Amino acid sequence: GIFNSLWFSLGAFMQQGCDISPRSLSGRIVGGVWWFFTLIIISSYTANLAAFL
Amino acid sequence: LDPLAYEIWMCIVFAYIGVSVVLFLVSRFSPYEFGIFNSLWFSLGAFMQQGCDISPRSLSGRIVGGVWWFFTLIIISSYTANLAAFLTVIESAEDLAKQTEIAYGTLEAGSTKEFFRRSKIAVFEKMWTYMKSAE
Amino acid sequence: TVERMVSPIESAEDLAKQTEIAYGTLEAGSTKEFFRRSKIAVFEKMWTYMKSAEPSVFVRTTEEGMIRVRKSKGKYAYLLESTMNEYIEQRKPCDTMKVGGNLDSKGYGIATPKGSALRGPVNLAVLKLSEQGVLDKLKSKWWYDKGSALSLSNVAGVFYILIGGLGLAMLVALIEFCYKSR
Amino acid sequence: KNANQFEGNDRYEGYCVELAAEIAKHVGYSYRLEIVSDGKYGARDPDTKAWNGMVGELVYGRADVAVAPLTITLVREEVIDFSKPFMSLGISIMIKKSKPGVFSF
Amino acid sequence: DRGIQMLITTVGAFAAFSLMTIAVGTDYWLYSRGVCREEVMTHSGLWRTCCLEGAFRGVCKKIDHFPDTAEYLLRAVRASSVFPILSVTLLFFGGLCVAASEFHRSRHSVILSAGIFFVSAGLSNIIGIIVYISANAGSYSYGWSFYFGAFSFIIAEIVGVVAVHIYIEKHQQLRA
Ligand SMILES: CCCCCCCC/C=C/CCCCCCCC(=O)OC[C@H](O)CO
Ligand SMILES: CCCCCCCC/C=C\CCCCCCCC(=O)OC[C@H](O)CO
Ligand SMILES: CCCCCCCCCCCCCCCC(=O)O
Numbered sequence: 161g162i163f164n165s166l167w168f169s170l171g172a173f174m175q176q177g178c179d180i181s182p183r184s185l186s187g188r189i190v191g192g193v194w195w196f197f198t199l200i201i202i203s204s205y206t207a208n209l210a211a212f213l
Numbered sequence: 214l215d216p217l218a219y220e221i222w223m224c225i226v227f228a229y230i231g232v233s234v235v236l237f238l239v240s241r242f243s244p245y246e247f248g249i250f251n252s253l254w255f256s257l258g259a260f261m262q263q264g265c266d267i268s269p270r271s272l273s274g275r276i277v278g279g280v281w282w283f284f285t286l287i288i289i290s291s292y293t294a295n296l297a298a299f300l301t302v303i304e305s306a307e308d309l310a311k312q313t314e315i316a317y318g319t320l321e322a323g324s325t326k327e328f329f330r331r332s333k334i335a336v337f338e339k340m341w342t343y344m345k346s347a348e
Numbered sequence: 349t350v351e352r353m354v355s356p357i358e359s360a361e362d363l364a365k366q367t368e369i370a371y372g373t374l375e376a377g378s379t380k381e382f383f384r385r386s387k388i389a390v391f392e393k394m395w396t397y398m399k400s401a402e403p404s405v406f407v408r409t410t411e412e413g414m415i416r417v418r419k420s421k422g423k424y425a426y427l428l429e430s431t432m433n434e435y436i437e438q439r440k441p442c443d444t445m446k447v448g449g450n451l452d453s454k455g456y457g458i459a460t461p462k463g464s465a466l467r468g469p470v471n472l473a474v475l476k477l478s479e480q481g482v483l484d485k486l487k488s489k490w491w492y493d494k495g496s497a498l499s500l501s502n503v504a505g506v507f508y509i510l511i512g513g514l515g516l517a518m519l520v521a522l523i524e525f526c527y528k529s530r
Numbered sequence: 531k532n533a534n535q536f537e538g539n540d541r542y543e544g545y546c547v548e549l550a551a552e553i554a555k556h557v558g559y560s561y562r563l564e565i566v567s568d569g570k571y572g573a574r575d576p577d578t579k580a581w582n583g584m585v586g587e588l589v590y591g592r593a594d595v596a597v598a599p600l601t602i603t604l605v606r607e608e609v610i611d612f613s614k615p616f617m618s619l620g621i622s623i624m625i626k627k628s629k630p631g632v633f634s635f
Numbered sequence: 636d637r638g639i640q641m642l643i644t645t646v647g648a649f650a651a652f653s654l655m656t657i658a659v660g661t662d663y664w665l666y667s668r669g670v671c672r673e674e675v676m677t678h679s680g681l682w683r684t685c686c687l688e689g690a691f692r693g694v695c696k697k698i699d700h701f702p703d704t705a706e707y708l709l710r711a712v713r714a715s716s717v718f719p720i721l722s723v724t725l726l727f728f729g730g731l732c733v734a735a736s737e738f739h740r741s742r743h744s745v746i747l748s749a750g751i752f753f754v755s756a757g758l759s760n761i762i763g764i765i766v767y768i769s770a771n772a773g774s775y776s777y778g779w780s781f782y783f784g785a786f787s788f789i790i791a792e793i794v795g796v797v798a799v800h801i802y803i804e805k806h807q808q809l810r811a
Contacts, residue, residue: 177264181254188254195261199289207296220500220768227761227788228510234754234792235514239521241803242747244528249796273521280513287506287635295498302352307359310449335360335450338620339430342450357623371623376570376583378601379621409569414624422626430622431599437624445627450620454603457612458553459596461588464611466557466595471613473556482552483616490545500765501772505632507765511758518751629773632705 173198216295217288225260225288232256232281239273247274260285310339316347352496359448363425364393371425372405373398374413379427380406382452391451417444427451431491438494539563549616550597564593571600585610640801641737644749647794648733651753652726655760655787659719662695663778665771671696680780681716681767706773713770718763719784725756726791733798743805750798753791760788 164180171178172194182191214222233253240247247255251267258265259281269278303309309317317340319326329341357363363371371394373379383395398405407413413426414436425447433446458474460466477483500507533541539550539562547563554561564587572585580586584600587593588610601619602612658664662680669677671686671694678687685695700714712718729752736745764784 172263175262181258181266185250188257192257192261195258195263198263199261203289203293203296207293207300210297211300215497218497218499221498221503223785224500224507224761224765224768227764227785228507230789230792231514231758231761232510234757234796235517237796238750238754238799239517241799242525243521244524271521271524273517273524276513276517276520280510280517284506284510287503291498291503291635298349298352301349307448311358311447333453333620335452335620335622337449338453338618339449339622342430342618357625360623363623369625374571376568376573378571378603378606381573381603381605382621417624417626420626424626426624427621428624429599429601429619431617431619433622433624443627444624447623447625450622452620454601454619455615456599456617456619457602457615458549459585459588459600459606459610459612461591461594462609462611464594466559467611467613469557470553470595473553474613474616476556477549477552478614478616483549486545486548487617499630499772500768502630503635504630504765504769506635508632508762511762514758518754629706632709 169194173201175202216292216299221288228284229256229260232277236269236274236277239277240269240271243271243273245270256281260288262286262289306340307336310336310343313343318344318347357425357447360390360394360451364390364397367397369423369425370401370405370420371398371427372407372413372416373427374410375406375408378454379429383427414444435491435494438491546597546599550595553595553597561595563597566598571598572606574605581609637801637804640797644733644746644794644797644801647790647797648726648730648749648753651756651787651790651794652723652730654783654790655719655723655726655756658780658783658787659716659723661780661783663780664767665775665781666778667775678778681719700770709766709770709773713766716763718759718766722756722759722763722787722791725752725759726787729753729756729791729794729798743802746798746805747802750795750802753795753798757788757791757795760784760791764788 168178168180168182168191172191175198182188233249233256236247236256237249237252240252246267247269255265255267255269255278259278262285269275303312303315309315319329329337329344332338332341355362357369363369373383383391383398386392386395407416407426410428410432413428417424417426418441430446430450437445458470460470474483539547542563550561550563566584566587568583568586570583572581572583574581581589584593584596584598585606588596596610599617600606600612602615606612659681662683662685663678664681665679666687667677667679668674669679669684671677671684671691673689675689675691676687677684679685679698682698683695684698686692701710729749732745732749732752736749739745764781
């Protein structure tokens with residue numbers, strides 16, 4: 161539902177995983193691109209903080 | 214995508230397909246739900262360090278999962294480390310003389326051309342040797 | 349990062365500032381004499397280093413310095429004349445390279461004993477040869493006519509371990525199958 | 531290459547060989563190319579005050595001309611005569627121009 | 636859909652074998668600037684390098700694969716193209732099993748072994764690509780021979796998955 165969708169997305173971005181994963185093909189496409197986005201963005205945060213320090 | 218070369222990205226995609234297919238194969242013909250679709254989802258989630266809903270239970274599934282986990286850890290760390298390197302790393306006459314990508318010239322029949330022609334200083338002799346031959 | 353942050357000589361000062369690479373000159377040459385009698389800060393520093401450094405940085409012949417740089421595995425920087433440097437860098441085993449500009453500007457001359465009767469004619473001959481393009485042609489003949497992202501190689505081991513693991517997993521599956529099927 | 535087939539000044543080749551030939555043609559003289567024995571260009575030893583190499587060969591009378599890449603310097607100009615330069619140059623630095631490794635990760 | 640599954644398996648087996656054999660034979664793996672005996676644009680493959688322009692155009696020279704145990708082994712493995720050839724051999728045997736399945740429907744393991752050959756062929760293909768790229772490293776672009784190898788890998792893996800589905804459904808249907 162909408163509240164569990166928000167929780168799944170938040171946990172994915174914080175790399176904390178979840179208690180439910182999408183089972184359909186459309187849910188898994190959405191989950192996969194959000195996982196890729198999360199990986200690039202968090203690596204970019206750590207890398208640029210290392211540069212600044 | 215710049216931190217890793219195009220060949221690394223292409224081989225990551227191939228390795229992903231091969232891992233998913235071998236996980237599906239060893240799981241179907243094994244005493245003891247990894248169909249092909251679920252195998253692809255397990256592998257994608259493993260590479261994105263996002264975990265999953267199912268983990269392999271057999272010895273062969275766990276060997277496949279373990280080496281894919283190790284590969285993922287090395288490749289993701291390599292991406293972050295090289296991005297940190299790129300983000301952490303002429304402005305002179307010597308700099309202009311040492312390189313060859315930028316062409317440099319003078320005014321014809323001018324004091325500067327005469328200065329470079331009759332120079333005895335190392336750097337300016339190197340500069341004149343280049344300028345006289347440049348075409 | 350320490351890697352990308354690394355840099356080459358690119359100038360004389362960068363050779364003078366460091367001390368890990370030894371740099372020498374030819375013994376009994378104009379370059380040694382130029383360094384000895386210099387009053388320029390960088391050149392005086394270089395000379396004070398070269399005279400006192402042990403073992404002797406100097407060499408006996410140009411070929412000797414060339415082989416010393418080729419066999420010092422990038423720990424020796426030879427100071428020689430630009431013409432010889434250019435000619436060498438144009439020939440195999442082309443593993444040597446000229447760095448940066450010149451340090452000064454000078455020229456070769458045809459010498460004669462003081463008070464010689466050949467002095468005047470030789471000067472006029474050199475001017476004739478220069479104005480007729482002979483020296484240019486000889487130079488062109490003897491010099492010119494002689495003539496980062498991580499790569500798959502940086503992570504190839506992890507690919508080989510991965511595919512080896514997949515192969516091992518398939519073998520273990522077959523063994524388990526044959527065991528549990530009997 | 532294969533100097534054994536030749537003898538005398540014709541045993542050698544190179545820029546200065548042709549330059550000596552052309553100078554001899556213009557000045558009108560015959561010459562024999564003697565290689566310096568020391569194999570050194572030339573310098574005044576501060577202790578003995580003796581010139582060695584080609585400059586020594588020129589000053590002491592053993593040679594009448596030097597057609598080597600001999601740099602024009604003030605110390606040499608005080609003891610031997612030089613013509614106008616026939617080639618320009620400067621002091622320059624020469625430096626030597628790593629497989630990652632399968633398990634380098 | 637067993638008829639369509641067998642059609643896909645046979646057509647895919649032939650396609651993978653054809654693409655991989657052409658790739659191993661043709662000479663458009665890499666566009667670089669080397670020399671067929673000045674440097675000009677060339678087009679190398681697994682065995683020969685050729686000039687793409689100029690006078691010596693069309694002239695090809697055997698690649699001197701050879702000029703540190705690891706460097707020696709990589710150069711040896713890349714010189715003999717062991718892995719691309721092994722992947723061609725395994726695709727051939729997989730094709731033989733797929734064809735033999737129909738003429739002998741008594742034995743089930745025949746199509747399973749076809750699937751396993753195709754999967755193994757894909758893995759050999761991957762090791763070949765890695766060895767090739769790594770050995771080259773020791774400007775440029777990749778030609779159509781390279782991509783024929785890559786597409787052979789993808790099709791081989793798809794045909795393996797389909798073959799294993801056929802075997803699984805035969806045992807599931809017959810057992811129950
Ligand atoms: C219970 C299930 C577990 C099974 C699955 C677990 C897989 C996880 C680890 C894989 C890496 C193992 C291989 C590590 C690589 C060794 C390389 C090495 O020893 O290199 C020698 C060195 O290079 C000399 O110079
Ligand atoms: C069973 C699972 C179902 C699968 C679910 C799908 C989600 C896959 C995840 C993300 C990767 C996509 C991101 C990569 C996008 C490729 C495009 C790109 O990188 O463009 C580069 C460009 O070509 C410049 O050269
Ligand atoms: C589970 C593994 C799959 C992960 C997906 C990662 C996305 C890979 C994208 C690769 C595209 C190749 C293009 C290289 C980019 C370039 O050279 O410009």
